[PDB]
C-alpha cells in the first residue's frame, strides 16, 4: 500500500508488559551478571549505541569555547586571477579555433570546482560563525535596553529632585 | 543487510511528521483502539534528549508525537480537524521549536 505497515514489535507490548518491565529488567540484569530476541520484553530495553558510532541510511553514511587563513585568502585571489586569465584564453580559443574549445572548458570548471571545495571546507569553519553575528546583535540590543533604562530612571530622579527644590522654595 | 531496530524506529519517528500518514493511521479503528500503538508512542518519548535528538532529520515530528501524546487525553474525534489545525498552528509551533533549540 501507500503507507507501510506499522513495525511488528509495536503490537507485542501491552500495559501488562509495561508494568512488568521493571522486574523483567531486574531479572535480566541479574542474569547478565546483536542482542538475541529470546523474550517478547527485550525491545523495551534501550538499544545499545553501535561501537563504530555510524549510521547508514538511503546509501549515505553519518557519524568548545562557543558552547594560515592568509594562505587560503591569497590562494583564492590567485585562483580568481587564473580563472579570469583562463576565461580570456578560452574565449580566444572560441574566437580562433572553437572546434577544440571544450578541451579548456571543463578545465576552467575544475578551478571553479576547486574554489567550491575551498568554499565547502569553509562551512564548518561560516555556519558556527552565524552564532557570532547573533552574539553581537543581542548583546547590542540588551545594551541599548539597559542604557535607556538608566537614562529614563535618571531623568525621573532629576525631575523628582527639581520638584523637591521647587517645593522647598515655596516653603 | 537487515537494518537494525534503530533505523526502523528513527524512520518511523521521522515519517510521523507527515500529516497524510497521521490521517491514514488514525483512519483505521484498530490502530487507535489497540493499546499497543499508544504504548509504543509513549515509549518513543525518550528521543527528545541528546544524543538521540542529534540523529533526527525533521524536528517537527518531535512536537507531533507530543501532540499525539495529548491525543490520548483529548479523546477518533478531532481527526477531521487535524490538517486544518496543523496548518493553522504551524507558525507558533515552529517558533516554540526554534526557541527550544536555536536559543
Amino acid at each position: 500500500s501507500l503507507y507501510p505497515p506499522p513495525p511488528p514489535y509495536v503490537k507485542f507490548f501491552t500495559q501488562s508488559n509495561l508494568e512488568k518491565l521493571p522486574k523483567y529488567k531486574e531479572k535480566k540484569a541479574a542474569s547478565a551478571k546483536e542482542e538475541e530476541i529470546t523474550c517478547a520484553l527485550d525491545y523495551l530495553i534501550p538499544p545499545p549505541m553501535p561501537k563504530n558510532q555510524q549510521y547508514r541510511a538511503f546509501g549515505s553514511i553519518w557519524q568548545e569555547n562557543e558552547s594560515n587563513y592568509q594562505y587560503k585568502i591569497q590562494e583564492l585571489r590567485k585562483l580568481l586571477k587564473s580563472l579570469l586569465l583562463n576565461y580570456l584564453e578560452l574565449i580566444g580559443v572560441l574566437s580562433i579555433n572553437p572546434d577544440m574549445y571544450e578541451r579548456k572548458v571543463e578545465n576552467i570548471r575544475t578551478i571553479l570546482v576547486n574554489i567550491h571545495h575551498l568554499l565547502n571546507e569553509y562551512r564548518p569553519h561560516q555556519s558556527r560563525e552565524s552564532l557570532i553575528m547573533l552574539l553581537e546583535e543581542q548583546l547590542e540590543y540588551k545594551r541599548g535596553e539597559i542604557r535607556e533604562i538608566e537614562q529614563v530612571c535618571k531623568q525621573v530622579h532629576d525631575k523628582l529632585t527639581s520638584i523637591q527644590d521647587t517645593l522647598r522654595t515655596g516653603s | 543487510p537487515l537494518p537494525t531496530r534503530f533505523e526502523v524506529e528513527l524512520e518511523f519517528i521521522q515519517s510521523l511528521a507527515n500529516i497524510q500518514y497521521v490521517t491514514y493511521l488514525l483512519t483505521q479503528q484498530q490502530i487507535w483502539k489497540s493499546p499497543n500503538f499508544k504504548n509504543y508512542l509513549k515509549y518513543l518519548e525518550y528521543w527528545c534528549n541528546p544524543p538521540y535528538s542529534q540523529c533526527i532529520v525533521y524536528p517537527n515530528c518531535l512536537f507531533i508525537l507530543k501532540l499525539l501524546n495529548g491525543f490520548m487525553e483529548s479523546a477518533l474525534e478531532g481527526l477531521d480537524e487535524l490538517p486544518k489545525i496543523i496548518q493553522l498552528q504551524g507558525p507558533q509551533w515552529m517558533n516554540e521549536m526554534v526557541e527550544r533549540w536555536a536559543n
Binding site: 500500500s1 501507500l2 | 490521517t23 491514514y24 483512519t27 481527526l79 477531521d80 480537524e81 487535524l82 490538517p83 486544518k84
Partner: peptide, 25 residues
C-alpha cells in the same frame, strides 16, 4: 419571488474517505 435562499452549509472540515492503495509500482 424566492422567500429565502439556503444558508451555505459547506463542510470543508470533512476529512473525506477516499481509499488510496495503488501507489506501489
Amino acid at each position: 419571488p424566492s422567500y429565502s435562499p439556503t444558508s451555505p452549509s459547506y463542510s470543508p472540515t470533512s476529512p473525506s474517505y477516499s481509499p488510496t492503495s495503488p501507489s506501489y509500482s
